[PDB]
Design a protein around this nucleic acid. Structure first.
Lengths: 176, 209, 38, 142
RNA sequence: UGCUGAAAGCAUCUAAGCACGAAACUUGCCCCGAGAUGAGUUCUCCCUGACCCUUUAAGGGUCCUGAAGGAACGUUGAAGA
RNA sequence: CGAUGUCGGCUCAUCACAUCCUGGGGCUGAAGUAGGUCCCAAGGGUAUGGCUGUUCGCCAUUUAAAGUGGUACGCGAGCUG
RNA sequence: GUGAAGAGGGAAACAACCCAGACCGCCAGCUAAGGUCCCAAAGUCAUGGUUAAGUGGGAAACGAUGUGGGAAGGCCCAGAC
């Protein structure tokens, strides 16, 4: 509605291909392709991207909004890219990158080795930071959710793999 | 991989050097020789049919003799079939020896067990005997009750009752192969395998991890 | 969480969401306010 | 005079091939059941199999509406006691989709020796080709 | 439990899309199993004669042949009422 | 009512889940260990004895646990009495 | 009122419910209740809505930004949410 009505301003050097419902967007950061719902009609009109509800379908407005935001993310994903930043709070928590495998030492009796998918590149400026970068937004959201999911932030102390921006609310023990 | 067809020679023991007796079963595995190879393009599945031993010339029938004659092989005492494992390749008339188990470390042995005939439910299903005294009237080894009452008013399927125990295919899994002797054509596995002495076995590599 | 047949907003941060045909109360302030099945 | 009765020695019956891609299961099934009874022929007779041979193909591509792709459950009991065995629609399409069309049509056909003989005339395939090119099935667009 | 994400310019695990997730479920393991009348497949083996009759049919009969194989019989079995 | 044998024990089960154990999980007045409570889950498992005709119960000593019910308060053309 | 002492059609099956009261015959028509996609006779009829829960095709207090309609009302492009 109010989201679908605002157009996606496509910057220079970004390639947009509308093959029916399939949308391919390729810029400086990588080819990234979706297939929208059938209730979304997308029109380029030479300057921007415009999203409207395909006629005959009930919830198409709602669908259109999603398509909007998704392609907005895709435009950032071919221009600037997305970056999640995770930090590891705990005594003896280690993070390293061999190739695209994130080795993690999280107080386990076995090493943790997370295989990143194809499009995502992680770095470690410190032993207790993982700054991972990529193009698709749900994919780095996914991967940061997995790395958090190995050791989630424990509530009493804060020990775990937290996001750099997220606040972790603590509490004391029962008595004394 | 594939297996080989043996013959239960009997049991012995193998004293180790540090003095631990190992109960072994001796399985003579002669030259299993391939009589047919089966491909997807003709049968829908990849498998070899082997034979072993030797049969009398007058006792093998003309169908059977024509089969072994096509294969270019001596008639054996039977035909068995092993499913192939996607990268294996055999030719017809190729002989397979116990040497195949020179790496395998643990096998599964399949035979027909010893036929115990019509067995009652105490032997067969380990039912527990009722009182041997204290009043009991002609019902010592009998099965007890066999079902409920008006609801269901039927005995359910696969109620454990008495009947033929024994004389059926059983596979013993994960037996430690103690020796492979290519000279005498022998395979010594640790433990008991199914069957009386002289019974035909089928020794495959263990599918369990 | 609390499976009840009356789910309500206990706090001002509590929030009614229907997921998979199930009414739920998702709070951010207090996780004791998490509820299901209204 | 007497009402005409079809004679099963002299019933002529044709071969039809039906593509089941994207058809609704019950609506296709009901049309097939009508054609296999022989209800579409004026020589219909309730104790004579007068229907046609139908070759249904692309049985794995049949469609259902709503959440019936995952909620429609096919129960059967095995005879052994706790033998109630269920399988949803997508599990059946994965394992054997022929069973989906054949269960439907079979439940729409009269139970009895005749309706078993009527179901023997339905030939379902999960693919696009059939062995029955010798019988020359003409394309029944339904 | 999430990720992206609107309807609801925020928020939101769900409406479109996507990822995890248990001894339950389908397989994997063992056994039975083509009467699976939907009675399947593969390999091999055997049989390559004449002549009548009629209400001419996948009809009946006579002579000559009797295969592959099975069954019977016997000696029997760690198979078996 | 021209008969449907009725407690308890034994033998033999079988289903339900409103789960005792094992398995997954949320909240905790959850530091850990051990818990409490609630959701999911029926695969498999789920005592021996003293007393008593007893089911039950109390006690002794175990156990991962000694589940709750239906099945003519399952089971006497199966046993006991 | 029906059954008893009343058949027939319907309600799956169902004395007592709905329709209807069987003298006999007919391979004739029209109807009642009830129905018309297939089992199973007859609309996969026409027009306009509603629900997506297989609701329809059990079950309440109570809970809930499910969704269609109606009448008002507060604030609002001196810019509201």
């Amino acid at each position: 509605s109010r989201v679908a009505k605002a157009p996606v301003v496509v910057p220079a050097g970004v390639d947009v291909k509308i093959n029916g419902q399939v949308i391919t967007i390729k810029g400086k950061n990588g080819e990234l392709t979706r297939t929208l719902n059938d209730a979304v009609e997308v029109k380029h009109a030479d300057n921007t991207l415009t999203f409207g509800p395909r006629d005959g379908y009930a919830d198409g407005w709602a669908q259109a909004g999603t398509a909007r935001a998704l392609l907005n993310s895709m435009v950032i994903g071919v221009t600037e890219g997305f970056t999640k930043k995770l930090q590891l709070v705990g005594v003896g928590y280690r993070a390293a990158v061999k190739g695209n495998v994130i080795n993690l030492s999280l107080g386990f009796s076995h090493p943790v080795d997370h295989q990143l998918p194809a499009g995502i590149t992680a770095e470690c400026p410190t032993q207790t930071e993982i700054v991972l970068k990529g193009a698709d937004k749900q994919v780095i959201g996914q991967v940061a959710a997995d790395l958090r999911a190995y050791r989630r932030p424990e509530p009493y102390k804060g020990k775990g793999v937290r996001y750099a921006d997220e606040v972790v609310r603590t509490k004391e023990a029962k008595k004394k | 991989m594939i297996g080989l067809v043996g013959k239960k020679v009997g049991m012995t023991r193998i004293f180790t050097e540090d003095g631990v007796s190992i109960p072994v079963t001796v399985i003579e595995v002669e030259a299993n020789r391939v009589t047919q190879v089966k491909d997807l393009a003709n049968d829908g599945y990849r498998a070899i049919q082997v034979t072993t031993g030797a049969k009398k010339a007058n006792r093998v029938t003309k169908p059977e003799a024509g089969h072994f004659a096509k294969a270019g092989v001596e008639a054996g005492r039977g035909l068995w079939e092993f499913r192939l494992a996607e990268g294996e390749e055999f030719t017809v008339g190729q002989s397979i020896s116990v040497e195949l188990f020179a790496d395998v470390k643990k096998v599964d042995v399949t035979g027909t067990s010893k036929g115990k005939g019509f067995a009652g439910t105490v032997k067969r299903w380990n039912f527990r005997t009722q009182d041997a005294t204290h009043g009991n009237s002609l019902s010592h080894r009998v099965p007890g009750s066999i079902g409920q009452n008006q609801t269901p008013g039927k005995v359910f399927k696969g109620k454990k009752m008495a009947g033929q125990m024994g004389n059926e295919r059983v596979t013993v899994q994960s037996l430690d192969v103690v020796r492979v002797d290519a000279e005498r054509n022998l395979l010594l596995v640790k433990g008991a395998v199914p069957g009386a002495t002289g019974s035909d076995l089928i020794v495959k590599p263990a599918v369990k991890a | 969480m609390k499976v009840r047949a009356s789910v309500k907003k206990l706090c001002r941060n509590c929030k009614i969401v229907k997921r998979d045909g199930v009414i739920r109360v998702i709070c951010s302030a207090e996780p004791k306010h998490k509820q299901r099945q209204g | 005079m007497k009402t005409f009765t079809a004679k099963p020695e002299t019933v002529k019956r044709d071969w039809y091939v039906v593509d089941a891609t994207g058809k609704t299961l019950g609506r296709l099934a009901t049309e097939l059941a009508r054609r296999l009874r022989g209800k579409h022929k004026a020589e219909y007779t309730p104790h004579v199999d007068t229907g046609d041979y139908i070759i249904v193909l692309n049985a794995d591509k049949v469609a259902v509406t709503g959440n019936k792709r995952t909620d429609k459950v096919y129960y059967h009991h095995t005879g052994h006691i706790g033998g109630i065995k269920q399988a949803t629609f997508e599990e059946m399409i994965a394992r054997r989709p022929e069973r989906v069309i054949e269960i439907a049509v079979k439940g729409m056909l009269p139970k009895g020796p005749l309706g078993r003989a009527m179901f023997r005339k339905l030939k379902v395939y999960a693919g696009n080709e059939h062995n029955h090119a010798a019988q020359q099935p003409q394309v029944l667009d339904i």
